[PDB]
């Protein structure tokens, strides 16, 4: 069971929206990445459409050769959109202060009914749901209890570690959380903030299923090209596992 | 006298500022482009520091191997900064509705004193000033009258042409403006909005001195890498001239 | 301007339809071509949707950064599809033997009424029409009379030339045909069957506006990759005109 | 233990044939592939020679540097050619409806006389025979009972699996079919319809001797070139066993 | 018109023959070079089949996409092989003491009877003949009387030029000889011995039709690979005429 | 430990010597290969200096960054050259009828006196000696008694193996012979005749110390360039031991 | 973690200072290395600023995406510079002969007071200290006693080993030294003089934390380019530990 | 008319020497450069052999495939070596203060006896001599009066020009100096300190025969590799003349 990699192309759109032209087109990047080590493409459809737009989602859904992971907030609009779109995966994320925790994860343990409804609903649509949460066992437990098949652990605190001791600390937390989530029947993803220098430690955690990385790749891309940027990340990820 | 190309790296910073990390770093891109066909690097130091930051300007000024073109508004702050920085070039641009025209060019013909002061001031600092203006002969004339050594014609209307007839129209206007500006002792640049498909027609206009292109290059870069993106643009630009 | 390259990506889809998978996708090929030297993308919507399908046209129309040239037979179905799709260019080709001539181009001189009608109806939709015809003065004069802004000379016979003498003769004929056509106010294209070894003599012809090439490019792509295949064809074309 | 890759270049030919030209030439693709990770080259010599032709087989036979794997229907014409051509391997496949099962595999269970004879005849010419069958125990036993050295499991259903569950269900089917086939002294292959995204789980299966892949490889090749298409596939395969 | 390049791939077979293996296979080099700047492929079927063998010719004749230039001695064996093979071109070269010049080229002045017969016989077969001679007037007049449509000047002496004077003189000798041949209605070629550093002076000679180079190309190819080697040669040649 | 690769660059000089030119120059190949996977460079100073010449050895001895493996016949001339040259290694090979085996390797069992003298004399000079012998016990015992520290098994017969049976047997023969040699205190090498498709089985033999390959590498290099050719071989070797 | 690579870019600046230009700039090299396999960048601020200057350190400190390892002599000037610069790592090296030992590493066992002081003062600035010393137990025990968290074993002698025996001996010594050092709670690095051909034996040593390499990498960069030079060194290092 | 490029590989050696190793080796750089656009290779054999050494010159002389240009001070030691070494070109340069003018050039005007003798002596050994002088009429006349075939104008001041005006002033100086030098029968060169950014204006100057560049090329090479560094420079030079 190879460690999978989902490439988030959101920032290709960031770059496009700055001038309101058609380029660069997320649709092209998706092709490059899928053929360069990406097992899935991730797009976050924000409410304010900062980058990825409804057009993007609509055409990508028809052009992706692998599968879509729709990052979105738990709101009527987005729930409706995802059910309509039928993405293979859906990643629920906070987008406001009430749904967010002190670390930026989805507050599941405090919104059990809302999350329960959302999960069954997305599941009836044939969508595999992933609740984006902190390496918090309480949230991890609640996630399991509301029926999500996946949870994506927030690796941002780890990415932003200011000292090695602080980083090693966040690593351990993440690792124990993953092990705990698995013992609950959850498959577990991570990836937020991961870079070419801190990706290996996470990739090594056995419970990890897939890593959703975006920015570091797109940031490497402007220099070296998307093909090599994605390929390097996948190479490093597999090395971590061997 | 080879047609020169200045690569605007602003959007590398756009990409960086989206997540507040250090990468991608404009400093790296500047190296790649200078060695890939760029005769100068252009950075726009906006008042709100959307992308390029004071850090950027400060280090770039020490790392560029060619020369800096500081795009900036005519305000006390920016005038002070540029005098302090001593860029080789300075490109005055509108950033508000009063300094802008109906086309987005710097309103020179209506602010002669402000522009006159700015030009002599930047010139005393040893800076070669370029007034960013529309292909308007009135503005072109005023630009000459206030003492600017350069003017950069706004090629955006041309870039955004919706029909070929409309485009050919904007081309002619641009070409006659350039010829007119030259007969006034001005050296003339262009470049805003130019892309890999419409760059040749502009590059062919003999009066053109240097083209300041940014977005299309950076947008091509996320796919192919900055090296080739800059090189392709310079290749197309020189073909236009032969 | 300079000789333009219209890349026909039909065979990308013949490879696809040979299996029923979604790969390779013409949408990707189009992006690669548009960035490798192609000034337009061409697709031939056959009545039997043998390669290019309606889905290809619908999506391509939204993804192309340049413009679409739609080759199609002159039937109510296609004209309706074409009027609705609104591509920049349209090239009317024969699909049935009662449509073809001795050498293989559209038969305009014999179907002036239908052709006059088509041209009018497509031009009304804002589409610029081109009639694919043999290097035949009769057909060329008729193309003009019916209102077409373009004609595309069928370069097959020249590409199929079995001897050096037969080739030089076909060449001369194409060139004299092009000049005549121009004298009638027509803009002229070509490209069918053109290859890496025989494209220069055609590109050297001054009246040539755009060369639409497919098979030879795709044929080189399977070995080399589309990016280089296209850039090569383009390079050769511009060398011929210098 | 060392997983071999067998590249099928049939679709290089389909491309060519869609036009009647000499290119792209299968003979070229074989050199490229044999030097990019291919251990053998496969060609399916169909009755209607829709792609690979008698010339191809005649020249490929004198130009391959590794070995030929002739795919063919069980007929007198083919057996006769195979015996004469003396290819290293031979893969008996269904071309007609009365010789194919309900899922696609060659119907050996229901043609034991025909197959027993094919095998003895081909084996008598020093050709190692493989029967292209479904992952079905009844067919595998017939295969062994008749004497074939090899069998090639049809991964068609696994490749076409719509849901993840449906895919895992089909994987287990193949893996148990292979283990079983091995217990009866058969060497087992696969490959039909495998892609850069599903090949690994099949390559992980121990009993696999050689994987015969074609379409996905050629489909990647029109984009990246045959060399990298072939080298990637090989790399993924060995990664799966590592 | 277009200055052409014939690539002699003889030395590919030279590397092969030093071992009795099948690699490297001339057939592969051919595809590579024709797709990288070669306009024709040249092979010299020596009597002793030192490198090129009958199978090479037999198969190349079937795989070449451009055309064959068969270099050969004048012997009944070779004339029959040539008439059977029907290569597009035939270059008659000296292989024995009695047929050579002290300078190395074919002694046509001394074998007027033989050569006349060869030119006629090869001509009725539809083969364009070239005589490999020295930049000598007597041999050129001989070549002319005998009926050869082409001549290939021996650029050997120029290539081994020891001083800058010695070289400039041989250059001049060829330039005049080429003009002399043309005034006689002969088309002229050269190439033998030409390298990456001395080719341009020869390519610049107006009367030159095609350059038949092999050894310096193969010698560069062992380091950089055939493709770039061939492409690089072609480029230097085109640079010479620009 | 590390399985090593000695690259025989003899055939570089073979291409050169076919013309008396200075290119390709063995000295260049050496730098290329040592920097691409070679751990040593091997040259065979034949008596007739067919390829490698004294200057090659004289200069290589000065430019090599790793070390020289001098292949040579046992003659007073060569022993003196070797003692003078002081290459790190010396591989004694058969060049005349009286010194060869019907299989091709050095006949040590038949020249015990001569070989013993060579090993001692070359040894006092500080050269590690290897005897090029067949995978034969009598020759190995002979090599052992005479004092040679190394032996290089002749993988020729295995390389020219006609069937999969013939090959598997020669493999087995070498594997056992290698173990036999080691039990005698000899270090063992091989390589001759090994290609990109048969090298792995040999590299996997535990007792193998270094593989001295040349011809298949040069033969691949003519197409792809030395660097990738060498690097690719090295990789296959490392893959074999993993 | 995995063996880390510390790339020393000092020689980038020795190339620069050899002329007084601004190129090549170490700032660029650092970016290339950080993206090619380097986990840290090393610079040696010599008292004579022979290559790396203060400007290099000041800017690098702001541009590096990983972390700075500053090599420096133990003087008040450097310590003050180091305390202020706050690099992640500091490696104390001898610059004067009253600082060096027999083999060339720092002399800690003889200057325990100064070293205890340094370590304390640098650790107080938050810098992690490493003492560059020979593979000498006495020096290692003293490094520990004075408080250093790291030591870097001087691999020069092993890299300079004039014979295989001298090399294996130096190796064994380094390995035994590393183990001892570890038993004292010290983390151990190495790398001086390490090359592409001798780096594996050192990387294979388990106690090795990071390898700091410069000269050999830069030496390969002038030929190959930094990106590949680094990626190669890295590749070799990770192969050694697998 | 055909501008030649002469690459100086002195700094490849400075790199090497800064460490006492064998690499990087100048012999390697010369092959790379000679095959990437260099028409000759230059080496400055200084008195203190700080970079290029007697070994280098001795081996480079037997390995160059184009020709050697020996830069040296006018002394007995050097003349003697030059005469023996028999380099194709020789460039007399100042190494001491009493032999250099106020701007840098060789003082010929003030050492007519010394120079007249050097020239006659070197010329007597078949060496073409060039005097490295300033763009100063007094020195150019002395150069011609003494007999030197060539002169190499020192572009040092133009390269170091601080302001644009100062640069144009220095350019005109060089261009008039060259035209003048030409009128006296001298062949004129340049190159010192030229970069990828200022080389073109110098290459545009008609009278220029060969440009000798080194530092900028090697400085680009540590980043991109010597091949592209050399090929870019050549490309820019020819673009300037085109």
Curated annotation (Swiss-Prot), chains A, B, C, D, E, F, G, H:
The entry's protein name is Pyridoxine 5'-phosphate synthase
Lineage of the species this protein comes from: Bacteria, Pseudomonadati, Pseudomonadota, Gammaproteobacteria, Enterobacterales
Q: Which UniProt keywords apply?
A: Cytoplasm, Pyridoxine biosynthesis, Transferase
**One biological process term in Gene Ontology:** pyridoxine biosynthetic process
* Source organism of this protein record: Escherichia coli (strain K12)
Predominant cellular place of this UniProt entry's protein: cytoplasm
UniProt-annotated catalytic positions: 44 (proton acceptor), 71 (proton acceptor), 192 (proton donor)
Which residues take part in binding 3-amino-2-oxopropyl phosphate? 8, 19, 193, 214-215
Catalyzed reaction equations: 3-amino-2-oxopropyl phosphate + 1-deoxy-D-xylulose 5-phosphate = pyridoxine 5'-phosphate + phosphate + 2 H2O + H(+)
Query: Quaternary arrangement and interactors, per the entry?
Result: Homooctamer; tetramer of dimers.
The site feature described as Transition state stabilizer is recorded at: 152
